[PDB]
Amino acid sequence: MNPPPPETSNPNKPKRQTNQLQYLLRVVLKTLWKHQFAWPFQQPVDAVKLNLPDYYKIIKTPMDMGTIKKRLENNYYWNAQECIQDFNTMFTNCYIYNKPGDDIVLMAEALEKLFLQKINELPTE
Template identity: 35%
Template sequence: MQELMRMFSTIFRQITQHKWAWPFLEPVDVKGLELLDYYEVIEKPMDFGTIKSKMEAKDGTGYKNVREIYADVRLVFKNAMKYNDEKNQYHVMAKSLLEKFEEKWLLLLPKVAEEEKRLQEEEAEANSDMQRAREATYANMARELSSELLEVDKDLKNLKEMVIQKCSCRKLTSEEKRILGTALAKLSPENISRALQIVAENNPNFQATAREVDLDIDAQSDYTLWRLKVFVKDALEVNEKTTADTAFNNNDITEDKKNGSKRKRDSCDAQAKTNTKRTKKVSIL
């Protein structure tokens, strides 16, 4: 680009040093020449002095490429030709210099096009590199976030296990086991399968995936029972079965409620068998 600017500067100097270039070296003296309608005809005044100053600017206000300079040089001549009629000397001088300028520009144009293509390729490559860098950054952030979430899940699981371990120091009463069995019978087929998996995790001999499964509540360890209690409570809350959830967590049940719970248990056992009919038969003992 610097080489192109240097070559264009040579063309610019040749044009501005031409004997007919003097009317265009400075801004049009609109007031002195009493050109009252000049700004009505010419939308954007331009002159060689303004172009030269902009070419030499070091404060970032200068031209970014030779096409911008080319456009302003043409504008100088086009303005003169537009404001003055064809027989006017300024129109003739501007038209003649414009033709000479276009001839020189055509010789430079292939190099301009080549440089522009190179810059476009560089910009495309830079954008591609930037995009890859952004994607790599986002991928790293996603991995870090995923790791953090896994750690959080792990910590929550450990905390839950700790709570269960502490709770399991106390054995479930017969009434609590009965209520647990009733609550298990109210689970959906999907949650029944998940509950059986909990049992299998602490009892390798338990066939959780068998077609027919007998789940003996009394045969399970205290740890397994507490895990089942927590799971069933969460599952019933999700299903908005608040009545069963309240009964499941209430250890101070009256005698009337006990009798009512027994009737509900019989009903729920029948319902559980109906719900699991399509998948497996689960008998809660």
């Protein structure tokens, strides 16, 4: 079976607005979300629907952009690095599960290049 998706809201966590967090939602997430290669990354990988029975043998930290978007929207992240870590986990999950050169991998590589171009201009801490 699939695991439950990652948590996206916790009312007991403290909340802050920061320029870094705003940029991560309004520039980084938004830019990747609208990209023509985004759709396979907009929700959790459904290993049941996609017939990937071994997916969770190696992917012990699932992540996707739908989860990241919701986390940003619900003030789940305190430090910008928490969000950056989640993007990076999404990419690196893809590269450990899927054969090099598979279409999903080439899509993730293009998205990661774009992510790094946007993260380059992240506001200071």
